[PDB]
């Protein structure tokens, strides 16, 4: 019933070193879901790392980690792995494991990072991507008022009539949580006051009315082309 992901294996490593991460999955049939590795730099910027299909038929790596990183899975042990080598200071981040959840529609299945683990921390002691321009840099809104976060993609994220735009909410000490998928569709148990809209290259997330618990950092994400890319983030605060 309760889907859980527990990353582990981090710690300090000198440059050029090696390290192996593990993620223990429980609460769902692990073998039927693709899995992601996503890292968050100390500047709160999200970077997709690697993806593996449920059956291990398709493997994607970010350009920053090609060759040095290796993603793998053991469906018998319900475990996902990330082999890292030739580590550099830019690799210093907290590494999250995200499940690729499929949402079935009338015309097909839409896949989104729907469940995230708490993450393990890694610290290294020293072109054709769809760039998502998120606006604004931050936000301070009073209780009950409207908060608007926009996103411009460097090119169209539409594919066969669907907009592959997603929105995530992240509170400090917690992993990102899915708000909106497919530009305008609401996630699991996400209140209707969160409303996504847009198409092609222009998208918007509206929070109205903003409540006290809505204080967090919000990210847009496109899931049309590899690599998965994130917006720079918008920190929403409540005026006192």
């Amino acid at each position: 019933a309760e889907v859980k992901l527990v990353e582990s294996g981090g710690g300090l490593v000198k440059p050029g070193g090696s390290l192996k991460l593990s993620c223990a999955a429980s609460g769902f049939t692990f073998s039927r879901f693709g899995m992601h590795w996503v890292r968050q730099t100390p500047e709160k910027r999200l970077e997709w790392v690697a993806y593996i299909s449920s059956g291990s038929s398709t493997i994607y790596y970010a350009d920053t980690v090609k060759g040095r990183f290796t993603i793998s899975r053991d469906n018998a042990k319900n475990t996902l792995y990330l082999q890292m080598s030739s580590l550099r200071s830019e690799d210093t981040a907290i590494y999250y494991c995200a499940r690729s959840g499929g949402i079935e529609r009338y015309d097909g299945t839409y896949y989104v990072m729907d469940y995230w683990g708490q993450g393990t921390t890694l610290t290294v002691s020293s072109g054709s991507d769809i760039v998502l321009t998120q606006s604004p840099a931050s936000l301070t809104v009073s209780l009950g008022q409207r908060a608007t976060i926009s996103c411009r993609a460097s090119e169209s994220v539409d594919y066969y009539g669907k907009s592959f735009m997603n929105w995530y909410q992240q509170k400090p000490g917690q992993p990102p949580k899915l708000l909106i998928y497919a530009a305008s569709n609401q996630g699991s148990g996400i209140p209707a006051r969160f409303s996504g809209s847009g198409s092609g290259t222009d998208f918007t997330l509206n929070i109205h009315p903003v409540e006290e618990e809505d204080a967090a950092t919000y990210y847009c994400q496109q899931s049309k082309e590899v690599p998965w890319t994130f917006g720079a983030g918008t920190k929403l605060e409540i005026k006192r």
């Binding site: 693709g34 992601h36 993806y51 994607y60 590899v226």
Partner: peptide, 10 residues
């Protein structure tokens, strides 16, 4: 077409 980590038609 099929997009492995993204979209599966039909």
């Amino acid at each position: 077409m099929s997009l492995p980590g993204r979209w599966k038609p039909k």
